[PDB]
RNA sequence: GUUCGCGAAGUAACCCUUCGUGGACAUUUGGUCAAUUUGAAACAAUACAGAGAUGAUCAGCAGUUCCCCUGCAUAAGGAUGAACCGUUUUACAAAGAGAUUU
């Protein structure tokens, strides 16, 4: 059977760059650690 | 409509009452959209068949895809979700030999 295959190339992000996205709100993307820390001097 | 001012009629004259007249106040809603067949939802129903790696029965996890579905979801599930299984000819040259032709 040929359904079991090694990867010839990985799926590129350029394909998704052209897609029109949806407005789903992900739990991990909710506001958190909203302020950046900076070093002295 | 209200109110400020003016003409007038009524009244003995004011108040008050009416007809006329000027100014002030208040100033542009709503539709991406019409009410059954012809601008688009799907399941279901009838039939047949009964799931990959196998001699046999099965757990799977992935990858690739201009297939996605369920789910709050970057989780998980959907037959390992499904499809995958076919078709495949030239960067075409070098050395040499024996036959063909003037
Ligand atoms: K079966
Ligand atoms: K399985
Ligand atoms: K699965």
Q: A28-32, long-range: CB within 8 Å, 24+ apart, which pairs?
A: none
CA distance A22 to A17: 13
CA distance A33 to A35: 6
- Record the resolution, in angstroms: 2.3
Residue A33 CB coordination number (10 Å): 6
How many residues are listed for chain A in this entry? Answer: 41
Q: In sequence order, what DSSP letters do the residues of A20-40 get, joined into one string?
A: PPP----GGGSS-S-S-----
Q: In chain A, what is the straight-line distance between the N-terminal and C-terminal CA atoms, in Å? A: 64
The DSSP call for residue A1 is -
* Nearest nucleotide, CA A7 to C1': B63
Q: Which residue is nearest to nucleotide B82 (CA to C1')?
A: A3
Q: What ligand has the least distance to the C-alpha of A3?
A: 2
* Nearest nucleotide, CA A27 to C1': B73
CA distance A28 to A36: 18
């Amino acid at each position: 059977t040929t359904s079991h295959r090694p990867q010839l190339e990985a799926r590129s992000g350029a394909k998704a760059a052209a897609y029109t996205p949806t407005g789903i709100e992900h739990a991990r993307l909710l506001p958190g650690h909203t302020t950046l820390k900076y070093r002295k001097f």
